[PDB]
Amino acid sequence: ARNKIFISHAAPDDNDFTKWLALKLIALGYEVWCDVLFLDDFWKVIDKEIREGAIKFLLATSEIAIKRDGVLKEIAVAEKVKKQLKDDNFIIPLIIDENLSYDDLPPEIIRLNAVDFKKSWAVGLQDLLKALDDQKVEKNSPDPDKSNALYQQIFLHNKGIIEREEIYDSNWFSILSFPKELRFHDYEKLMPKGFDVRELTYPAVRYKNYLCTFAWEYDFMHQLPKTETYNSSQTIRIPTEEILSGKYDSPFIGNFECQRLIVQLLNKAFELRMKEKGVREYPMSNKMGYWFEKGKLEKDKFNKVLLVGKQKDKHWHFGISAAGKLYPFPVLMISSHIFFTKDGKELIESKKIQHAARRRQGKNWWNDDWRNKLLAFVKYLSDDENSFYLEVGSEEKIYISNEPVQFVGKVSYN
């Protein structure tokens, strides 16, 4: 039997209204067939209902729904069906367009009284619900079960999460190799004036009064007078494999402190080698960026992705800040930055000006844009084919994969 409320409208524009109203009517127990809700000849199926299945013909009337001949065809058949039903209360227009003068409609509907949706949808639905009970349109119970099915089929089945596997490129670059053993030398007295390790060319830190370093006792001889004459067989040597495993626990030094010294040495070595590499640096608030400059990059670009650039008057430079973190797995966490230079030769000395540029320039770049720039900038660091080494001693050093760690995820989107 006819227990369906046909809803006709413009296909590309009136979707929003009809979707809300159809779902609203479905939630109330009605049976509402709409093309947005149940379309899958198209004229034949809708005609069957209009002449057999439809019991009401709600016209979402607007300044375009009355210029859509396809829609006018659906009224033309409705009207006839209305004559077959003698149901004068059949076509029940729905004017949502306040722009529509309400008095510029086709003769077929111009004689019929609308249901007003121009001022607020809620009263109009109240008006529609008022009319529908008045005309005794039957309706089922508003069960949120089969109705739930339509709701999801419409919006909550869309929530679906593509269950295919994706590959994510992070910004973690693992440390490929650490030196065989950690050495604690003693230059306390050999230190000419207990100076810092700025003179030392190899990463060294004086734990307590022992200058522990991955460089051998004899390595420091040029920049270290008196230390030049240091005897061996008096250096505390700890296995780095035991340290990273958190197994070495001695009253001389704890595992936490030893890893702290390892992290500090790695940070210094990165800063050192950085100087070895051809790239200008930038003093950030709490880190050191590397503002690539003209000349160090062909066409201000490398590995097929620029690492340098020029703004309207200034010049953007893709820089990075490295902080090595043993947790969870030894990695060199790298962070992306953008440094704006006055003429690609000197960075603006105004932090506010630099920040306001970073922001505006950030709008242009995308996910792929950041990934390509980061990976290309790292690949410049490569010494051999698949990595690059950061000296931790004349003999010992730390190698870092030039590709970031890949993360693979269970799901994706459309």
């Binding site: 929003d16 209204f17 809300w20 779902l23 939630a27 949502i96 306040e98 001022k119 607020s120 949808w121 809620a122 009263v123 639905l125 949120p144 739930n148 709701y151 919006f155 909550l156 869309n158 929530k159 679906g160 999460i161 994706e166 590959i167 994510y168 490129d169 992070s170 910004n171 973690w172 973190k325 947790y327 969870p328 966490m333 962070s335 992306s336 950030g362 709008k363 995308w366 996910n367 792929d368 950041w370 990934r371 980061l374 760690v405 890949q406 993360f407 693979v408 995820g409 269970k410 799901v411 994706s412 989107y413 459309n414």
Partner: protein
Amino acid sequence: MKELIYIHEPNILFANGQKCADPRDGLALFGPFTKIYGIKSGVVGTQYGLSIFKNYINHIQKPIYNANNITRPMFPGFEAVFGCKWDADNVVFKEVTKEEIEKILYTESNHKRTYDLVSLFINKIITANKNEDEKVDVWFLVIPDEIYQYCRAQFHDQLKARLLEHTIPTQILRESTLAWRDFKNKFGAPKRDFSKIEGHLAWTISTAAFYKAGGKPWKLSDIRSGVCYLGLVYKQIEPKNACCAAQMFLDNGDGTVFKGEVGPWYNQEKHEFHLNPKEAKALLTQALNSYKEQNGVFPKEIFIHAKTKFNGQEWNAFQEVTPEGTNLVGVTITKTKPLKLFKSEGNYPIMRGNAFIVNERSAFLWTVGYVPKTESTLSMEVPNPIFIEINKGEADIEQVLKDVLALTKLNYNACIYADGVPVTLRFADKIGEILTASTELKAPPLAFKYYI
């Protein structure tokens, strides 16, 4: 090859207990969990401000269509969503003259300037609150731009703070927001363009007004029963720190009760952002007593989370005041270590809800990502995930991830898809910004209606 486990998006209850994943869709389709009869407006502004407010209310009466309707859902209209009436003609308007604002602004003392600017508005509401029979549910303060830019010991913080003793829900709306079209930065275009996001603005403002007027737009149900999700935030006073607590728990009927549990708490310690044993014991006793009075029996778990890590002494105090049969889980949520995941081939960020498990005691959770539901990612740039560390106690690292993700979905101050940080922490942050704006208040209002 590193494997990322996935946590799905929790469902939030709506009218008649129906579930959905987006407030902007769940409300527009189903309606609020609890319906109010209507909202009596209250406006403290100029004639210009009153005209703007009435224009905006009548504008949101009609449906609001934003440019990209597909990605951000449109606004049906206030009564069409929530089911109550919000008319612009029921305004109990209290006029503020630009001249009295001007004489306030000319005072040399900046602290006295901001105090007097707060005092004007609050005394006019205070006065109306006691001298107007017309009942007002929410007081909407249409402030001009001069207040916002000249006055900068904050206007908003003190204004919300100095009304707490009277318990008056308020909503500040800068006239730049409501009249954004007629507020241009001399170029001929609006200072901030709402054109493509007008519908979402209507969503946010209407949701905030509905919440502050006694309505519950949506509630949470995808959380473990018997657990009191409790969040601490520490705020600086210059050398004192103030701790604020917000607690969310299911009741006997499994309905979330979200309420603050905060009394003034000041700790003087060499270590920054910690708590002396007395303050910690008082805080936990307050929270446990609140749960006891709401549900009768004691919680089966006290899921304490914070942006900082707990030391030994305060945890021992926590355990000492805790009864038997109740477990304590202290979780630290940090958002500082940059772990930016770039998708290999494509142009849209990692999906929200992906989780990287470090080990049995830590994880990374992408509470910000790309949500297919709106097709609009919550982050313009690459989203930094939150580091969830089970600092103390025993817990399942995946269960904690799903619990945090669930707690990220109760931001009533904005009708966004979900919050980047768990809501208890953000609302406790707001409380700390307000409770400390004024002098220590006795029995401060414990309901967010009076803060956000």
